[PDB]
Design a protein around this ligand. Structure first.
Ligand SMILES: O=C(O)c1ccnc(C(=O)O)c1
Ligand code: NI
Ligand SMILES: [Zn+2]
Length: 350
């Protein structure tokens, strides 16, 4: 509880030697208290690239682009998705850069941020979100989102189950004012986000240790949603402005991600944000030993079929054998300490 006492978003510039073992570097950033913010930025070494170029992708199909209709006022919004017809990246980029949807002119990011919160209910944009794929070359051995080699691999290993976007990669083609609503990951997992190219993506984050304060507040503002689902934030429809969070005393931080940067999110780290203009991001979830307890305790959406539920059985039997029978008989009373680094970080703590 002494590392990163302010729970602020940290940034890391590893060398190529530090960069190589993905799981070990996550254990390192946690030894530095990065997980306390819920969100960390890792800027990869200059010589690292995941792809020779992106010249060849115009013909790539976005099967289900989503028009984002936002309704609300005074810092509180609900985002509704309108599924559009499939389109090629070529088609998507022409719409993104057209006068009707392009990024407005601005000086500071604080200026663009005001325009985002002022305008998010007007001129609904299109997000090429949740596209099954990867833009990593097959030989890329470091921080390859298609194969991170974390203990999350036990899901597919033990059961054969693949969960799209969770243990497989997703691409996201943004335009100006496209959004991701406030959410934690499925099963309160970690996630990795790489911005392959284009305009920036801005992020807000609430520290895991304060996640419950955010839920209590969301539940107050959206009482119908709360009555009808145990975890409605997981619908990823709820936008809440940082001025509202400030007004109700929720600690949050912000950060802008540029092309070529990774963002890590941590178990129970609520995050939200928006794209600045035409870009492309890739992400997936992953786990460390610390996640197992979060997985066991995650409150899952109780109202949608096709919602992600992972069996924790394999993880408890393997990594917590002494609590297995207790947990099974429904008696495992463990309280999560959000400040604690993952066991794998021992190495870096003397
Ligand atoms: O679309 C995004 O940018 C984004 C960012 C962070 N997280 C998610 C998610 O679906 O968890 C989506
Ligand atoms: Ni996310
Ligand atoms: Zn639900």
């Amino acid at each position: 509880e002494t590392l990163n006492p302010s729970a602020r978003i940290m940034t890391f510039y590893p060398t190529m030697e530090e960069f190589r073992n993905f799981s070990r570097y996550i254990a390192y950033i946690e030894s530095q208290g990065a997980h306390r913010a819920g969100l960390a930025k890792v800027v990869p070494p200059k010589e690292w690239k995941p792809r020779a170029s992106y010249d060849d992708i115009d013909d790539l199909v976005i099967p289900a682009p989503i028009q984002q209709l936002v309704t609300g006022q005074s810092g509180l919004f609900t985002q509704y998705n309108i599924q559009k017809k499939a389109m090629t990246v070529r088609e998507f980029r022409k719409i993104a850069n057209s006068d009707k949807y392009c990024t407005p002119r601005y000086s500071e990011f604080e200026e663009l941020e005001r325009k985002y919160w002022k305008n998010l209910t007007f001129n609904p944009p299109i997000y090429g979100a949740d596209v099954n794929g990867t833009l990593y070359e097959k030989h890329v051995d470091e921080w390859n989102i298609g194969r991170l080699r974390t203990i999350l691999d036990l899901v597919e290993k033990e059961s054969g189950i693949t969960i799209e976007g969770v243990n497989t990669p997703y691409l996201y083609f943004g335009m100006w004012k496209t959004s991701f609503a406030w959410h934690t990951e499925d099963m309160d997992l970690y996630s990795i986000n790489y911005l392959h190219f284009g305009e920036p993506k801005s992020w807000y984050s609430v520290p895991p240790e304060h996640g419950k304060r955010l839920e209590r507040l969301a539940k107050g503002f959206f009482p119908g949603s709360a009555q009808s689902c145990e975890a409605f934030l997981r619908h990823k429809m709820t936008l809440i402005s940082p001025l509202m969070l400030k007004k109700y005393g929720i600690p949050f931080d912000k950060v802008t991600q540029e092309a070529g940067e990774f963002m890590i999110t941590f178990p129970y780290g609520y995050h939200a944000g928006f794209n600045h203009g035409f870009n492309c991001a890739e992400s997936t979830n992953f786990a460390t030993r610390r996640w197992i307890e979060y997985g066991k305790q995650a409150v899952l959406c109780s109202c949608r079929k096709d919602m992600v539920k992972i069996s924790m059985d394999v993880f408890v039997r393997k990594f917590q054998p002494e609590r297995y029978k207790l947990w099974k008989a429904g008696k495992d009373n463990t309280v999560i300490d959000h400040t604690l680094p993952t066991p794998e970080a021992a190495e870096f703590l003397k």
